Scaffold this motif. Structure first.
Motif, short mmCIF file in Angstrom:
data_model
loop_
_atom_site.label_atom_id
_atom_site.label_comp_id
_atom_site.label_asym_id
_atom_site.label_seq_id
_atom_site.Cartn_x
_atom_site.Cartn_y
_atom_site.Cartn_z
N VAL A 21 -81.74 -16.18 57.41
CA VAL A 21 -80.63 -15.91 56.49
C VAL A 21 -79.72 -14.80 57.03
N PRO A 22 -78.38 -14.93 56.86
CA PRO A 22 -77.51 -13.81 57.28
C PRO A 22 -77.89 -12.57 56.48
N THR A 23 -78.02 -11.45 57.20
CA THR A 23 -78.55 -10.22 56.65
C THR A 23 -77.78 -8.97 57.08
N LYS A 24 -77.64 -8.07 56.12
CA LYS A 24 -77.20 -6.72 56.38
C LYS A 24 -78.28 -5.76 55.89
N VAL A 38 -77.80 -18.31 46.43
CA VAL A 38 -77.19 -17.14 45.80
C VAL A 38 -77.26 -15.97 46.76
N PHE A 39 -76.48 -14.96 46.44
CA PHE A 39 -76.56 -13.71 47.17
C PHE A 39 -77.70 -12.91 46.64
N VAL A 40 -78.39 -12.22 47.52
CA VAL A 40 -79.51 -11.34 47.19
C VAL A 40 -79.29 -9.94 47.78
N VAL A 41 -79.45 -8.94 46.90
CA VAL A 41 -79.41 -7.55 47.24
C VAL A 41 -80.71 -6.91 46.77
N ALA A 42 -81.39 -6.17 47.65
CA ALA A 42 -82.70 -5.63 47.28
C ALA A 42 -83.02 -4.31 47.93
N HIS A 43 -84.01 -3.62 47.37
CA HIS A 43 -84.36 -2.30 47.82
C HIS A 43 -85.87 -2.09 47.75
N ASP A 44 -86.43 -1.47 48.78
CA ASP A 44 -87.84 -0.94 48.75
C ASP A 44 -88.83 -2.14 48.57
N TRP A 45 -89.72 -2.15 47.55
CA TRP A 45 -90.56 -3.34 47.25
C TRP A 45 -89.71 -4.58 47.04
N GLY A 46 -88.54 -4.39 46.44
CA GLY A 46 -87.66 -5.51 46.23
C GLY A 46 -87.21 -6.10 47.54
N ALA A 47 -86.98 -5.25 48.54
CA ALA A 47 -86.60 -5.74 49.87
C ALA A 47 -87.73 -6.48 50.51
N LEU A 81 -78.15 -11.90 52.48
CA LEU A 81 -79.02 -10.86 52.03
C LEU A 81 -78.50 -9.48 52.44
N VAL A 82 -78.50 -8.57 51.50
CA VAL A 82 -78.38 -7.15 51.76
C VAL A 82 -79.69 -6.44 51.37
N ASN A 83 -80.38 -5.88 52.34
CA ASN A 83 -81.66 -5.23 52.08
C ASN A 83 -81.55 -3.75 52.37
N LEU A 84 -82.06 -2.96 51.44
CA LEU A 84 -82.01 -1.56 51.52
C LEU A 84 -83.40 -0.98 51.77
#
Length: 321
Positions: free
Chosen positions: A254-257, A98-107, A124-127
């Motif tokens: 994993v491919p990441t932005k 699946v696609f994963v988008v996350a931020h802060d602790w989530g990242a 993955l998109v990590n913020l």
């Protein structure tokens, strides 16, 4: 449809999951001191473009129950990733990745998800929080205290009950407003007995992105739960450092932005800019796309710059079809 809410039993917890849309799954993972609700604009934006947006409350947060608040050791990065793996087995049984988008602790959680189980993540998109290469000399708490001293928030968060007592007379609403609207690149300080006095205020016009109603959503929830669950993540930093030794030298495959606001305190940790831009990051994360820095933004980019974040997410995940 409106956003739908349900309870899913995962890894010893009863986890609250918000969901909107149909189509390929995108899992959104919030940070501190946030909730599923921090993804409100992206859920809509992506659901309207043919994806199923799923956003839980993490262990210790919001409507998610069962984690023992009195035992911070159960808020380790291993427990957290275990939650997410089990969640994906429960709610996305027909999607190997699946696609994963996350931020802060989530990242942070997402980086370790990708390390431990790359077979589960398409992209993955990590913020905000860049990959944290393990420092062999000391854990993050000790590291941050050496630089910023004992009033640094990570240090002040360590002993159970202390920060909770600091915040009690102030109320969740004021605490949350102060944190959510914060824009200075320095870390938060919480000197004993000084409440929110060491945190500077930005001009009010710069927080017009947060409505009173949106603030109240967070305030009302943290007033019910308290902050212990959320703060416990920081209390587990020392054990996280010990438990993650097997992954020294390991790469995220994993491919990441990665996206960060210009003024995010995390981006101004000494050495972070150099790691992120001068090659360290790309060595640890070999499929990392060009890094995105949002001009004029601070930490809470999904709410502050919703269109930019939503579109950055869409345009990245569209590359994989």
């Amino acid at each position: 449809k409106k956003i739908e809410h349900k309870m899913v039993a995962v890894n010893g917890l009863n986890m609250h999951l918000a969901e909107l849309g149909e189509g390929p799954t995108i899992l959104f993972i919030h940070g501190f001191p946030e909730l599923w609700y921090s993804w409100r604009h992206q859920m809509v934006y992506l659901a309207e473009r043919g994806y199923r947006a799923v956003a839980p409350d993490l262990r210790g947060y919001g409507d998610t129950t069962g984690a023992p608040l009195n035992d911070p050791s159960k808020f380790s990065i291993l427990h957290l990733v275990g939650d997410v793996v089990a969640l994906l087995e429960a709610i996305a049984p027909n999607e190997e990745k699946v696609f994963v988008v996350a931020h802060d602790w989530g990242a942070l959680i997402a980086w370790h998800l990708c390390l431990f189980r790359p077979d589960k993540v398409k992209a993955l998109v990590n913020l905000s929080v860049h990959f944290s290469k393990r420092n062999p000399k000391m854990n993050k708490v000790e590291g941050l205290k050496a630089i910023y001293g004992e009033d640094h928030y990570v240090s002040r968060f360590q002993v159970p009950g202390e920060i909770e007592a600091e915040f009690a007379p102030i109320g969740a609403k004021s605490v949350l407003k102060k944190i959510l609207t914060y824009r200075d690149p320095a870390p938060f300080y919480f000197p004993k007995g000084k409440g929110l006095e060491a945190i500077p205020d930005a001009p009010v016009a710069l927080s017009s992105w947060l409505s009173e109603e949106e603030l109240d959503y967070y305030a009302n929830k943290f007033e019910q739960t308290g902050f212990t669950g959320a703060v416990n993540y920081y209390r587990a930093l020392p054990i996280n450092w010990e438990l993650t030794a097997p992954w020294t030298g390991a790469q995220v495959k994993v491919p990441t932005k990665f996206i960060v606001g210009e003024f995010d305190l995390v981006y101004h940790i000494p050495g972070a800019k150099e790691y992120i831009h001068n090659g360290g990051f790309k060595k640890d994360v070999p499929l990392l796309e060009e890094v995105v820095v949002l001009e004029g933004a601070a930490h809470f980019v999904s709410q502050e710059r919703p269109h930019e974040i939503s579109k950055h997410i869409y345009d990245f995940i569209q590359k994989f079809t």
